[PDB]
Amino acid sequence: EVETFAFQAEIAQLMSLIINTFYSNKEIFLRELISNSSDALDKIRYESLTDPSKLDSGKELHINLIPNKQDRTLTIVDTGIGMTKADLINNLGTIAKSGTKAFMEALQAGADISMIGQFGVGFYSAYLVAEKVTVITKHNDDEQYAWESSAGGSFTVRTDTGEPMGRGTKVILHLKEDQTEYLEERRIKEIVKKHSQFIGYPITLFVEK
Numbered sequence: 001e002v003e004t005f006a007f008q009a010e011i012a013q014l015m016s017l018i019i020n021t022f023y024s025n026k027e028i029f030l031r032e033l034i035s036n037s038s039d040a041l042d043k044i045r046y047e048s049l050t051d052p053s054k055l056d057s058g059k060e061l062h063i064n065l066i067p068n069k070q071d072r073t074l075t076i077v078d079t080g081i082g083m084t085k086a087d088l089i090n091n092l093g094t095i096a097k098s099g100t101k102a103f104m105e106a107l108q109a110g111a112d113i114s115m116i117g118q119f120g121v122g123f124y125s126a127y128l129v130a131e132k133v134t135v136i137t138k139h140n141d142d143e144q145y146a147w148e149s150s151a152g153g154s155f156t157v158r159t160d161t162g163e164p165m166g167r168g169t170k171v172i173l174h175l176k177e178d179q180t181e182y183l184e185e186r187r188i189k190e191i192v193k194k195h196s197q198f199i200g201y202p203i204t205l206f207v208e209k
């Protein structure tokens with residue numbers, strides 16, 4: 001059972017701006033997704049202080065970066081707090097509406113796309129490099145879900161039947177034909193060292209066949 005939803009107009013406008021604006025410094029997408037992973041791990045770590053049973057779905061707090069040249073995908077996995085169905089469909093997009101307005105205003109005043117994370121909508125920078133994004137996610141209080149969008153104004157949500165994750169979020173970037181540089185070990189290493197060197201969780205860069 002696959003459910004299709006429309007993005008809110010402001011979010012659709014944000015994604016088309018990210019896809020259509022000429023902007024060469026695309027590598028910032030990785031810093032934004034890693035920063036989102038770090039916040040999600042912070043949240044589960046804090047909640048587990050007053051409720052240790054919240055870690056029964058996995059004690060390890062880490063970030064994995066997995067390239068796959070055959071599938072042309074880059075996957076960012078974290079064992080953070082994960083997202084509920086209400087998050088995927090409603091809450092996160094609603095939160096993002098204010099940050100989207102402030103971001104587009106700042107852009108008209110001189111800011112540039114690399115500052116997108118200052119407005120709380122850094123996740124959508126995935127579309128600087130990805131033609132499609134799949135998010136698999138598992139929150140302690142809900143089921144495992146797969147969210148998916150190739151932009152164009154709509155996204156799908158479905159119950160995920162694949163490998164159970166325990167808890168956390170998997171962002172699968174299906175890269176555009178001309179952005180496969182982000183599948184190379186030395187390029188990812190350079191980006192993580194440049195933008196995410198003080199993240200307080202172990203970041204493991206997987207290597208390929």
Ligand SMILES: FC(F)c1cc(N2CCNCC2)ncc1Cl
Nearest residue numbers: 088092093096120121123135147
């Ligand atoms: F619903 C989706 F558009 C979506 C949004 C999102 N966020 C945007 C707001 N700030 C960070 C969290 N994270 C994951 C997803 Cl799958």
